[PDB]
Amino acid sequence: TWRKWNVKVNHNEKRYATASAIAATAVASLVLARGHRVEKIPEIPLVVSTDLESIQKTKEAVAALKAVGAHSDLLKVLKSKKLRAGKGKYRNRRWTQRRGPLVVYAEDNGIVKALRNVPGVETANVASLNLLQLAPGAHLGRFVIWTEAAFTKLDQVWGSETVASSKVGYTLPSHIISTSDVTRIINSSEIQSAIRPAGQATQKRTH
Amino acid sequence: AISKNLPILKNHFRKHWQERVKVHFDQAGKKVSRRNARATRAAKIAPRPLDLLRPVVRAPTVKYNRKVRAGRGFTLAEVKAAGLTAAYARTIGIAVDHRRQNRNQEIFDANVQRLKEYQSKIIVFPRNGKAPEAEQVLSAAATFPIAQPATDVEARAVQDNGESAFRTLRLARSEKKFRGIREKRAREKAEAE
Amino acid sequence: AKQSLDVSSDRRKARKAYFTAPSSQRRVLLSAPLSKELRAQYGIKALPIRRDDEVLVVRGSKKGQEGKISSVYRLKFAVQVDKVTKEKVNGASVPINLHPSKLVITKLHLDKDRKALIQRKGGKLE
Amino acid sequence: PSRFTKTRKHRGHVSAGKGRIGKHRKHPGGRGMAGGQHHHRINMDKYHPGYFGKVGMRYFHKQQAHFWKPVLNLDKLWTLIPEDKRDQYLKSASKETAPVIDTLAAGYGKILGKGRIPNVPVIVKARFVSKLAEEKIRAAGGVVELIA
RNA sequence: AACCACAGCCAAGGGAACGGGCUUGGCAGAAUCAGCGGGGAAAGAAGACCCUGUUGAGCUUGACUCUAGUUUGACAUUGU
RNA sequence: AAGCGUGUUACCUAUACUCUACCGUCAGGGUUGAUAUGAUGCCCUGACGAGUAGGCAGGCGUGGAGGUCAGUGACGAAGCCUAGACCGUAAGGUCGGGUCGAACGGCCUCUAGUGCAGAUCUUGGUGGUAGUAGCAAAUAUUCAAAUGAGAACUUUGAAGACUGAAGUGGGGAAAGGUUCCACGUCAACAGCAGUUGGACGUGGGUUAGUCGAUCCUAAGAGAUGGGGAAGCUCCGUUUC
RNA sequence: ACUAAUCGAACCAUCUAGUAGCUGGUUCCUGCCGAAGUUUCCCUCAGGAUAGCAGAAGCUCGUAUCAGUUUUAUGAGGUA
RNA sequence: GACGUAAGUCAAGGAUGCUGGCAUAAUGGUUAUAUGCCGCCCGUCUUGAAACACGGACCAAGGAGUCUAACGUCUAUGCGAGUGUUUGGGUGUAAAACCCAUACGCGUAAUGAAAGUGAACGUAGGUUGGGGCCUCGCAAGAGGUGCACAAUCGACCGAU
RNA sequence: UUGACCUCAAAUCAGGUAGGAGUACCCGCUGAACUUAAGCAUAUCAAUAAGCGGAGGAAAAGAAACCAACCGGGAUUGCCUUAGUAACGGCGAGUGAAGCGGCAAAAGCUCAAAUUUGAAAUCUGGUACCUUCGGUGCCCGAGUUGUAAUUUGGAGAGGGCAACUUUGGGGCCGUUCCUUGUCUAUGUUCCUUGGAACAGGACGUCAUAGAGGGUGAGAAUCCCGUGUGGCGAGGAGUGCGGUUCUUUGUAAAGUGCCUUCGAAGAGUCGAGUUGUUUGGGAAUGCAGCUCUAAGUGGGUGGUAAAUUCCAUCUAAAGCUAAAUAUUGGCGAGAGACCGAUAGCGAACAAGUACAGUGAUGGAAAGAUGAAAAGAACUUUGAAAAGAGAGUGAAAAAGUA
Ligand SMILES: [Mg+2]
Ligand SMILES: [Mg+2]
Ligand SMILES: [Mg+2]
Ligand SMILES: [Mg+2]
Ligand SMILES: [Mg+2]
Ligand SMILES: [Mg+2]
Ligand SMILES: [Mg+2]
Ligand SMILES: [Mg+2]
Ligand SMILES: [Mg+2]
Ligand SMILES: [Mg+2]
Ligand SMILES: [Mg+2]
Ligand SMILES: [Mg+2]
Ligand SMILES: [Mg+2]
Ligand SMILES: [Mg+2]
Ligand SMILES: [Mg+2]
Ligand SMILES: [Mg+2]
Ligand SMILES: [Mg+2]
Ligand SMILES: [Mg+2]
Ligand SMILES: [Mg+2]
Ligand SMILES: [Mg+2]
Ligand SMILES: [Mg+2]
Ligand SMILES: [Mg+2]
Ligand SMILES: [Mg+2]
Ligand SMILES: [Mg+2]
Ligand SMILES: [Mg+2]
Ligand SMILES: [Mg+2]
Ligand SMILES: [Mg+2]
Ligand SMILES: [Mg+2]
Ligand SMILES: [Mg+2]
Ligand SMILES: [Mg+2]
Ligand SMILES: [Mg+2]
Ligand SMILES: [Mg+2]
Ligand SMILES: [Mg+2]
Ligand SMILES: [Mg+2]
Ligand SMILES: [Mg+2]
Ligand SMILES: [Mg+2]
Ligand SMILES: [Mg+2]
Ligand SMILES: [Mg+2]
Ligand SMILES: [Mg+2]
Ligand SMILES: [Mg+2]
Ligand SMILES: [Mg+2]
Ligand SMILES: [Mg+2]
Ligand SMILES: [Mg+2]
Ligand SMILES: [Mg+2]
Ligand SMILES: [Mg+2]
Ligand SMILES: [Mg+2]
Ligand SMILES: [Mg+2]
Ligand SMILES: [Mg+2]
Ligand SMILES: [Mg+2]
Ligand SMILES: [Mg+2]
Ligand SMILES: [Mg+2]
Ligand SMILES: [Mg+2]
Ligand SMILES: [Mg+2]
Ligand SMILES: [Mg+2]
Ligand SMILES: [Mg+2]
Ligand SMILES: [Mg+2]
Ligand SMILES: [Mg+2]
Ligand SMILES: [Mg+2]
Ligand SMILES: [Mg+2]
Ligand SMILES: [Mg+2]
Ligand SMILES: [Mg+2]
Ligand SMILES: [Mg+2]
Ligand SMILES: [Mg+2]
Ligand SMILES: [Mg+2]
Ligand SMILES: [Mg+2]
Ligand SMILES: [Mg+2]
Ligand SMILES: [Mg+2]
Ligand SMILES: [Mg+2]
Ligand SMILES: [Mg+2]
Ligand SMILES: [Mg+2]
Ligand SMILES: [Mg+2]
């Protein structure tokens, strides 16, 4: 029994990954690759009115999700339900399915219970934001639906350039490179005016 | 067996240690049970605040006496100064310690101020009154926090009298180191003729 | 999903409870739905199956066959309906075990206790 | 994890990396620190000189708290003033308003003299100070006040 | 049932210095039965002899270190 | 001479040498304002390749876990068989056909009770040996009938024998426990056989004032009183 | 000798997976590199530590410092 | 590069051109067999095994470097003179995730048995190298600066 | 003669109590060796295994003869830590605490030593009657060799003067705890394959219910359940309403000042010695034997001793919840666990069959089918059975 079971992670590093996963939720290419049907979604990050936080019934919550564009990702869940492929199916792990949207609210006024029964849908308070739900299977880009209060609160929770994070002593991590477009840096006239002319990209055979 | 350059270890595992391996799997469960116990006690004794008013004391030793902390109970001198009996104090939530003594006026004044301040902010329901609800506040300690007193001001005037603090420490050590021998030579010199 | 700490989602426990269920537990386990007309008449969805109830088979090879429950053979979680039988090659006739979940009640054997159970569940009882 | 260990790679190879001749055995040289003076002498004298034998006085019932005295150097002395209020004292360096630094409340027993503080007078309250540390503080225009 | 790596003809050579197999020759024809004790360094057992082990045990004694018992002294029991 | 000494040439052939290709490894380079999007990519150039113990690297396979393929599947999952096919140097992977019946994969990651020819290895199964060694102590069987599907062996009759009264006879004590007896009956057991049986199935059967136990004391065992012992308990049997 | 097929100290269970410098075994593939049986110490001689031989990780630099080689000059040696 | 005055051509930084048969078991693959030559039984200890050295009659399934406490080097990651949320508290969609005070540990100071004392003469030193950068030069090179690191002589702290 | 008292007996006297089991955890006693030290004896293993005695839901410990040396803390326990440190050790191998600090939980107290002495005011028992976990009266007894009240070192007592302030019990119903019952959505619509639809396709519905299970193949919507609330039943006992007992008190408690006092545990402390034990080192605890105290005394203050101080507690008597433990019992929820040679020895009539005199030892053994629908009937055979026929989706499922 005294085998190591839990693993200590540096707290700042846990926050580091949580922030990276929140940022990856806004990159539609990552969310598509992660497996969500956000191909018809009008814009990412998807932010919906704070009225979603007070929806009481599952039927109304589902209709609101389909209206804002989560219908294909909902249908992908509960079309993906499969029997587990081994002995796990009789250790109370009988079925498998995909993950749907993660609805992030700021105040649970009925939204959590209205979405409890919808297959594949999760809910979260902005104050917590589990990494296990933001990058399920360590795969970045979970399809997230933010309520407006949740989106607004997120600056207070994680900080900004003008607002200190509510987390004690915490600041969001610093980029070690100013951009990810190395091609555009190379194509900048400054470097272009310092480099020598290039060869052929496939050297002609001699002898 | 002793091998290449490694620090010498002292792993004490030469008894039947595997028979006494405690793994705190129940850390989360005991936490839930501790919060359940606190909620049960809070309901049982409501509207009382779940813990007794503790006094502020100095910590012992030279390592920790710079700090004050919660002590066990107010001294009998503190309770009498606050105007109440030890027996009544014990029934309105004040911890009383009969073995702590007061030799520090600053600590004694702080505890007596603590006691009057607590009396001002409690309501003792009558033994046969109407006993109105009074919004149970769980923590007395959070209501009456222990404050480290102010050692000095932020800034003031430099007063250099040429004392040489280092010289002072050296001379204090020397006078203590040589008191016994110097008294002995004084006593023998006095007794000679 | 589950909410209470008193109910288990463990498959082995569930199956053990099913197969070791005593007869008085199996009576509830062997409930059958009412027909459309009986649902309208009484206002209740399903009742524990009983002997003199009239039933319609609505699944399996005997679909559409009517009859009356000649036996609620709780020992193997089945009911036997007269008019529903297998004719063995040696001329004999033997009951077909039927599961009441695959049955539809078309007439109830109503006594005092059955009437009170309907009223307990919220039935019209007319 | 197990799949990255050399045990996995040694599967199919007879000796499991332990050699055919040497033939991994139970405790071929003894257990623990056996033979530290006999057949492990060379290792022990090469890597742990001073290991065997005795040293000076014994101390019965030693309490470390008697010896609590964290040292702080002058080059770190100004860090005990918070950064927000530090620059105000660093400018307008004068007496009659000099920062009192209580190094004991900061958790320090003795002020040492690693040196080069700015020329701003400061009032250093300490239990102990080195002779040079008090020289540099006085030279800067400050003072050390002995506290207990 | 024992037994069984695979098996089963020799000569010499070399070879872990005595081969059924390897090398060079001799040769070599299905399937077999009774018998036989040359060979299979046949089988039966992790040689019991010998040596090694910082592996024992039985026994002996002026071995080392002790011990039941027993003897001697003192104190107590213990008084007049 | 196809022997010996010597001399001359031609000729034979190594995984060695020369050249060429392919694989891999190492090294040095090229390639971004569409590198005409694979930059751990593509390409150029040169050299190199033995290997126990051992080190390292890149991969292959297995049980379970997070994610994905809204993957496969009763119109057949998995498993198994298949001198049928294809890919990979290889670990392996894939496909067809047969059998089969309910689940199972690909990829990205996580994790391990994760890969067998050996351990006089463990458990289980199976051979050759081999229809072989054998089924030879106790003197011995034979004729006929009956039964039965079937008779060396069952039954009956006839006959020949033996135990030879310290018995192969008639009872018992320990022990067994129904083996006793009757009916039915022969798959297994009776190292051949079997219609027979101490076998199998179902039943029946043991009757006491006088025979035993039960009572007595024997060598002994052992409570009590009482004394030891931390105590389990020990002593002692008429003692204080 | 015998003390239930057990006797130079029965049998049963546990401590106990007792310890072993000794015997046996130690399970996929390919690629690259690639040994030692010698030095010193050790109740050491079937074992270890130590150095050496080996791999791996690299790092600082970029043709040096060099070299199991010769030449020139200059030593040293006491074997044939 | 060659040839030709040029056109252009060529055997000049790696095969093209012309023609025929067949389009299937014909070539090829697989497999059985035959023929030539070769090939001793694996595993293991060992200087040396095919050994007249040991284990192995056969087959299936099982079958052996694990986990843990403390630690060394190396590597990845977070933060950095700091660092470590998870003893505990708060909270929860409840062993998860999320939040947190006071401490404590290790580091930021050494040295001496100990009592104790405790780190800038100097641009935090001088000398020799030293990548990179700077200036001058078409360049070579020359000059200035020189972090890490290396050698060395000093200075400072403690012990003597 | 008689009546006590003391001590000691008897009774199938009246009423009780102990034993034995279980023992995971707990309190003690007793107590190893394998092992390590590369040998070995001290040491280690280990104050462990085995053995013995005694508890409970926890136990034990516990309100300082404590820690400290500070500007002092303040019952006990447990956690983080102190710390693999002080220290112990063939100073080898190894071993190894405590104080402070942060936390969990917190709770305090009771006797002995005192004249009620203007009143043994105290208690078991018997008996009678009752409102029966008990009460009241009557009687016998216990008890002055001391039962009640009053005090416990924090104090407190006696006396003197001042005065003021606060009190008890008891039903119902209430909540609260436990046990348990019952009720509370939505398709079995069409098409295809199939023996079976629970599969695939279409169209829907509920969802605070798409946990889990069952049903002739993957079922939110077929059944049980799940989720959410509702309504009941039996029972526990503290905060609540409320109802009465209303000299229900000169009864109890507290409080200021003055004066006089202030009893505080002996074969015990302590010491010597022996043995054991500890990190405890001129001796950490424990135990035997010898010696054996005091009362501004006594213990401790981690180097033996004398002299002088100082600090800090108050032993030799006693009770106490919680935080802690828990390979047993009972009731639950679970798993990156095993999946019939695995997982407990045991998925099964498993501690069974079986072995051994005995202590003990101790297996193997899961799967037809959705349903026996478990093959009627014919024929060959003495029969087993075969061949047909037949059942089944399948007999390439026939209980071998
Ligand atoms: Mg599988
Ligand atoms: Mg190898
Ligand atoms: Mg080996
Ligand atoms: Mg073999
Ligand atoms: Mg062979
Ligand atoms: Mg041979
Ligand atoms: Mg050969
Ligand atoms: Mg030949
Ligand atoms: Mg022979
Ligand atoms: Mg041998
Ligand atoms: Mg032998
Ligand atoms: Mg030796
Ligand atoms: Mg012997
Ligand atoms: Mg010639
Ligand atoms: Mg190679
Ligand atoms: Mg898998
Ligand atoms: Mg198939
Ligand atoms: Mg085959
Ligand atoms: Mg099936
Ligand atoms: Mg394994
Ligand atoms: Mg095998
Ligand atoms: Mg092998
Ligand atoms: Mg024969
Ligand atoms: Mg005769
Ligand atoms: Mg005769
Ligand atoms: Mg007889
Ligand atoms: Mg019988
Ligand atoms: Mg026979
Ligand atoms: Mg027969
Ligand atoms: Mg018969
Ligand atoms: Mg008979
Ligand atoms: Mg063993
Ligand atoms: Mg090589
Ligand atoms: Mg020696
Ligand atoms: Mg050897
Ligand atoms: Mg000479
Ligand atoms: Mg010489
Ligand atoms: Mg061919
Ligand atoms: Mg050959
Ligand atoms: Mg040899
Ligand atoms: Mg070999
Ligand atoms: Mg051998
Ligand atoms: Mg063999
Ligand atoms: Mg074998
Ligand atoms: Mg296997
Ligand atoms: Mg105990
Ligand atoms: Mg030893
Ligand atoms: Mg040893
Ligand atoms: Mg020994
Ligand atoms: Mg011990
Ligand atoms: Mg024990
Ligand atoms: Mg009990
Ligand atoms: Mg408890
Ligand atoms: Mg107690
Ligand atoms: Mg006290
Ligand atoms: Mg305490
Ligand atoms: Mg520490
Ligand atoms: Mg000692
Ligand atoms: Mg110990
Ligand atoms: Mg009183
Ligand atoms: Mg189903
Ligand atoms: Mg369906
Ligand atoms: Mg539901
Ligand atoms: Mg006392
Ligand atoms: Mg003892
Ligand atoms: Mg000891
Ligand atoms: Mg004190
Ligand atoms: Mg088993
Ligand atoms: Mg089939
Ligand atoms: Mg088949
Ligand atoms: Mg079948």
For every residue of chain C, which 3-state class applies, written as one string? CCCCCCCCCCHHHHHHHHHCCCHHHHHHHCEEEECHHHHHHHCCCEEECCCCCEEEECCCCCCCCEEEEEEEEHHHCEEEEEEEEEECCCCCEEEEEECHHHEEEEECCCCHHHHHHHHHHCCCCC
Print burial letters for D66-89: b (CB count within 10 Å at least 16), e (below 16).
Answer: eeeeeebbbeebbebbeeeeeeeb
The SS3 call for residue A57 is: coil
Task: Name which of B5, B154, B166 is nearest D47 (Cβ-Cβ).
Answer: B5
User: What gap in Å lies between CA D37 and CA D31, rounded to an integer?
Assistant: 14
Question: Domain spans of chain C?
Answer: 1-126
> Judging by beta carbons within 10 Å of its beta carbon (0-12, 13-18, 19+), is residue B62 exposed, middle or buried?
middle
Residue C73 CA, ligand 71 centroid: distance in Å: 29
> Judging by beta carbons within 10 Å of its beta carbon (0-12, 13-18, 19+), is residue D148 exposed, middle or buried?
exposed
What residues of D are in contact with residue B153 (Cβ under 8 Å)? 100
Q: Are C123 and C65 in contact (CB under 8 A)?
A: no
Q: Are D122 and D142 in contact (CB under 8 A)?
A: yes
Cβ count near D124 (within 10 Å): 27
Residue D116 CA, ligand 22 centroid: distance in Å: 72
Among B72, B89, B66, which residue's Cα sits nearest to residue B148?
Answer: B66
Distances (CA, A) of D23 to B107, D8, D10, D19: 73, 19, 15, 6
CA of B100 to C1' of I72 (A): 10
CB contact under 8 A, C11 and A90: yes
User: What gap in Å lies between CA D20 and CA D14, rounded to an integer?
Assistant: 8
Domain C1-126 = CATH 2.30.30.30: yes
**Structural domain span for residue B104:** 21-126
Sheet containing strand D71-73, edge to edge, reads D71-73, D110-112, D128-129
Q: Are B119 and B84 in contact (CB under 8 A)?
A: yes
Residue C111 corresponds to which tokens in the numbers above? 């006594």
End-to-end CA distance of chain A: 69
CB contact under 8 A, A92 and C9: yes
User: What gap in Å lies between CA D117 and CA D110, rounded to an integer?
Assistant: 16
* Test the A interface: residue of C3, C9, C11, C16 with most A CBs within 10 Å: C11
Structure obtained using: cryo-EM
Identify the H or E element spanning D124: strand D123-126
Q: Are D128 and D148 in contact (CB under 8 A)?
A: no
Q: Are C81 and C63 in contact (CB under 8 A)?
A: no
User: What gap in Å lies between CA A30 and CA C49, rounded to an integer?
Assistant: 56
φ/ψ bin of B65: left (φ > 0), alpha (ψ from -120 to 50), beta (otherwise): alpha
Q: Who's near A113: CB < 8 A, 6+ residues apart?
A: A56
* DSSP states along chain B: ---SS-PPP-----S-GGGS----TTHHHHHHHHHHHHHHHHHHHTTS-SSPBPPEEE-SHHHHTT-EEE-S-B-HHHHHHTT--HHHHHHTTB-B-SS-----HHHHHHHHHHHHHHHHT-----TTS--------S-HHHHS---PPP-S-SEE-----S--HHHHHHHHHHHHHTHHHHHHHHHHHHH--
What residues of B are in contact with residue D36 (Cβ under 8 Å)? 2
Query: What is the signed CA dihedral for B8, B12, B18, B22, rounded to 10 degrees?
Result: -110
- Quick check: do B and C touch, 3+ CB pairs under 8 A? no
* B1-40 residues touching A, CB cutoff 8 A: 21, 23, 25
User: What gap in Å lies between CA B8 and CA D40, rounded to an integer?
Assistant: 13
- Residue located via tokens 């200590």: A8
ω into residue A45 within 30 of 0, thus cis? Answer: yes
Q: Who's near B115: CB < 8 A, 6+ residues apart?
A: B53, B74, B78, B79, B81, B82, B84, B94
Distances (CA, A) of A152 to A53, A104, A106, A141: 14, 12, 9, 20
Question: Phi/psi of residue B118, each to 5°?
Answer: -65, -40
Q: To 5 degrees, how large is the angle CA A157–CA A160–CA A165?
A: 40
